[PDB]
Amino acid sequence: MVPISPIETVPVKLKPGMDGPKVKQWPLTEEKIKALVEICTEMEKEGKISKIGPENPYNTPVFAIWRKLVDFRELNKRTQDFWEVQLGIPHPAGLKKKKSVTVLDVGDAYFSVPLDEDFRKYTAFTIPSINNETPGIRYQYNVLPQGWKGSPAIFQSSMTKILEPFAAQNPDIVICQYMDDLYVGSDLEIGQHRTKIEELRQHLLRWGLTTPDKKHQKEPPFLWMGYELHPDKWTVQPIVLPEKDSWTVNDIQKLVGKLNWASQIYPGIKVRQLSKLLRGTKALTEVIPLTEEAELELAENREILKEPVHGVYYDPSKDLIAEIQKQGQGQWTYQIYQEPFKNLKTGKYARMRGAHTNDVKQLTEAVQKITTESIVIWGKTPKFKLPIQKETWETWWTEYWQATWIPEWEFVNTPPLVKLWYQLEKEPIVGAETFYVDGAANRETKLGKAGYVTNKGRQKVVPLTNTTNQKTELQAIYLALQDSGLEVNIVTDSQYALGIIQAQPDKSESELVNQIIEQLIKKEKVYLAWVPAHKGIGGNEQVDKLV
Amino acid sequence: IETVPVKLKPGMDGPKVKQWPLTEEKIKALVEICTEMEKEGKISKIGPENPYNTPVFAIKKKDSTKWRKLVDFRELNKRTQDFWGIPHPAGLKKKKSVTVLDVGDAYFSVPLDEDFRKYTAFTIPSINNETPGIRYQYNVLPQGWKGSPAIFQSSMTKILEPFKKQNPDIVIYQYMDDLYVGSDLEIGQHRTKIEELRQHLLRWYELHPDKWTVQPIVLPEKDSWTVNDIQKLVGKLNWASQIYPGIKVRQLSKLLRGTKALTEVIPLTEEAELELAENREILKEPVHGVYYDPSKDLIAEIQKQGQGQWTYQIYQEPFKNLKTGKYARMRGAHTNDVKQLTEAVQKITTESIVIWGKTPKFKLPIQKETWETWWTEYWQATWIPEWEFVNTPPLVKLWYQ
Ligand SMILES: *CC(=O)N(C)c1cc(Oc2ccccc2OCCn2ccc(=O)[nH]c2=O)c(C)c2cc(C#N)ccc12
């Protein structure tokens, strides 16, 4: 016999202060008992388990579905935490094309990785006796049991330590571990490739691990995690949008799931209205009617999803480009590619929940998201193509009160273009009328007043019902914008209104703020000055609006 | 040569912080660095039985092209038991010049306690999540961990004993992996003395706090005031009245009576001139009842003033500023707001280390996603402070300009 190299065992402990499992074995039928006796006899003959005496106080229930299935949920609750087997799902667009990709089944190695001997006693289980007239057969695992908390991580780490020298001495190939399968890709000639595959089978056999000589079951196209992986391209598994006379909540969640999933390769997917119908429902069986916007959006989706689209694999010798387009209603779409008309992947970005916003902030956030995703998938930031002029961005970030930055980018003339819709003056305007505005409201009756007095003697006060102080302050500014020329100075004491306007929104939840924005867009010059209230600053008339 | 027992605070488990994504060049740099460290026994590979993690990235210090490995030990530092202390040198900030030296390599000669090593685990990440990452743990005192200067403190005293006995006029302070050496000599004599100290430490950053002072509130001096000028003056005086009690604005607000054009010139009455002069005299005095409490956090606020200018205030209680300043230095960040902000944060943190011996909690005028996306690209310091984000534009910005 050729000596087999021993696999180093991982020291395993229980959670602090806890003790091993002690679960009562379920009574089994005589047939199931016989089946488990045969299976456990074979496994004991193979070395996966070993018989133990009565000194072991631990027990884990065993079932047969024959097939043996041990329920380790309690021991899993009591087992220490391990490092994750994965920190994320690989994305197909990050894979690098290979002339040959071979699949090796290392499933038989799962039972060949030994278990820490001080921990084996916690895996004890009992086969019940026929008619329960003898003591049940007591076993404990000597290898990583299927279903135990630490089996995948210990198996992956053991396999990685085994494969490390083979991967080091063969830098012209690529070895990837995924569950109980190894994937070996290379650009070598097919003969040299199969040769190095045989070398890997030998190197693995030096630890006693067996790879099947049988022709494998996996072969192009690889179906994996909702993906189709082809030798030269990738896509998502076929996305079929069902025809429904009426849509329920789970149908809309299935549809928004199919659309979100399809959006990573199909450009232009929109999910705003369909996901908007799921607002605050929390009822899985509730039937919700479709708005017309959801119907137009769904029709555009069916038009985009009518014929297959594929993405290409990553070529590190070419540049990485990401292009963004605005879709409206806080929706954005983007394509990441290295060659024109050949996308690596696509995606979308929806604006965050907020009371006020503008397009520039949303484009910025989308750029940050694409940057992070790109560093995840490819390990580098892409060059951006953005629908915004250089002078627009320069004006924005030079005048914005927050620090902001977008990485290397270039302007692409693809409407709608992101623009600045208004810009407030830095100094008071000579020759322009000066509107002193104020508003006030009663906390109990909700009655208020909003108005202005100007240097030319122009005045206005408007009474309001069902309003607040903030609403009357905004309303006062709005009135000043309504009744003034193309250039106007505006004096307010509202720290709230100044806080809103200095954030430079172009859209808002409040219709009053949106009206103020529409007024600001029409003006040529607007200077907004703030003063402290109740300080006797004449013009600023708190009494005119508190009557 | 002998390990000192170290443990965590009662009831606290080790750190489990997600590793953030890294570029390919930073990953390769970390692979080279960590391979070399593994050859030197400073770190060792670990198995899946280690669930703890602390983030790692790579930087490039000043005047150097070599990559450096930076570990974000903030969570482990707050989860590590308190070590005990030495009173902060109040004379370090009064010295004419201070020089910062990186003494982090000396920590690697002292082994780390056996049972504590598993809490220093870190992960070199893989591109596209193909592997769970290359996992390491430290065998020696790691750079950036608060226990390293506390454990090495005796050895550092033994090494610095001859130099401190030779020059009693030189102040020496230690914070994390940095050594602050303050004196009053000439720049050339200071540099030769720094080479003397570095060759002294070998066989075993110009900073001038004297050119830094606190910034008072100033009011404009004009011969003709417009309505707008007076309105801004009344606003600033009203804001300063929260800090200084006797500030009075009623005589200046008297001039704003009536609805006048913003650009209209208004002459100052005599009562208004007297009020403004009294306000100047009040502002020339220091703030009443301003003290430092070592048990409280330090809070630093930064305002972007445009044109590469930044203002900052360090305080513990509102309107009780312990330090104010204006960073306008331009160093290869003329077109990058985030790089300027990161450099300002590092400078303010350094000043706070010199003055109080701890780092402040920053309020950054930036969206969370932008900052968290880009701040590691421009970070050059060994330590990392805490920060939060302000999303509403503060009105007081122009009052610090
Ligand atoms: C190993 C792993 O983590 N994943 C996600 C994985 C990768 C696959 O592709 C692969 C393996 C080794 C080397 C190179 C590549 O892919 C390069 C691009 N490419 C893909 C497919 C192809 O036929 N030719 C190519 O050049 C594959 C194929 C997987 C398949 C399955 C399944 N079932 C799961 C995971 C992976």
From Swiss-Prot, chain A:
Portion held of the full protein: 600 to 1151 of 1447
Result of changing residue 148 to F: 10% loss of DNA-directed DNA polymerase activity. 22% loss of RNA-directed DNA polymerase activity
Effect of residue 473 to Q: No loss of polymerase activity. complete loss of RNase H activity
Protein name: Reverse transcriptase/ribonuclease H
Consequence the record notes for mutating residue 433 to N: Virions contain primarily p51 RT
Effect of residue 437 to S: Slight delays in replication
Superkingdom to which the source organism belongs: Viruses
Effect on the protein upon substituting residue 274 to S: 21% loss of polymerase activity. 16% loss of RNase H activity
Outcome following mutation: residue 224 to A: Complete loss of RNA-dependent DNA polymerase activity. No effect on RNA 5'-end and 3'-end cleavages
UniProt effect for mutating residue 396 to A: Almost complete loss of RT p66/p51 heterodimerization. Complete loss of polymerase activity
Organism: Human immunodeficiency virus type 1 group M subtype B (isolate BH10) (HIV-1)
Binding site for Mg(2+) 1: 105, 180-181
Assembly and oligomerization: Heterodimer of p66 RT and p51 RT (RT p66/p51). Heterodimerization of RT is essential for DNA polymerase activity. The overall folding of the subdomains is similar in p66 RT and p51 RT but the spatial arrangements of the subdomains are dramatically different.
Protein task: Multifunctional enzyme that converts the viral RNA genome into dsDNA in the cytoplasm, shortly after virus entry into the cell. This enzyme displays a DNA polymerase activity that can copy either DNA or RNA templates, and a ribonuclease H (RNase H) activity that cleaves the RNA strand of RNA-DNA heteroduplexes in a partially processive 3' to 5' endonucleasic mode. Conversion of viral genomic RNA into dsDNA requires many steps. A tRNA(3)-Lys binds to the primer-binding site (PBS) situated at the 5'-end of the viral RNA.
Outcome following mutation: residue 252 to T: 96% loss of polymerase activity. 45% loss of RNase H activity
Annotated phenotype, changing residue 179 to I: 54% loss of polymerase activity according to PubMed:9533880; increases polymerase activity according to PubMed:9657675. No loss of RNase H activity
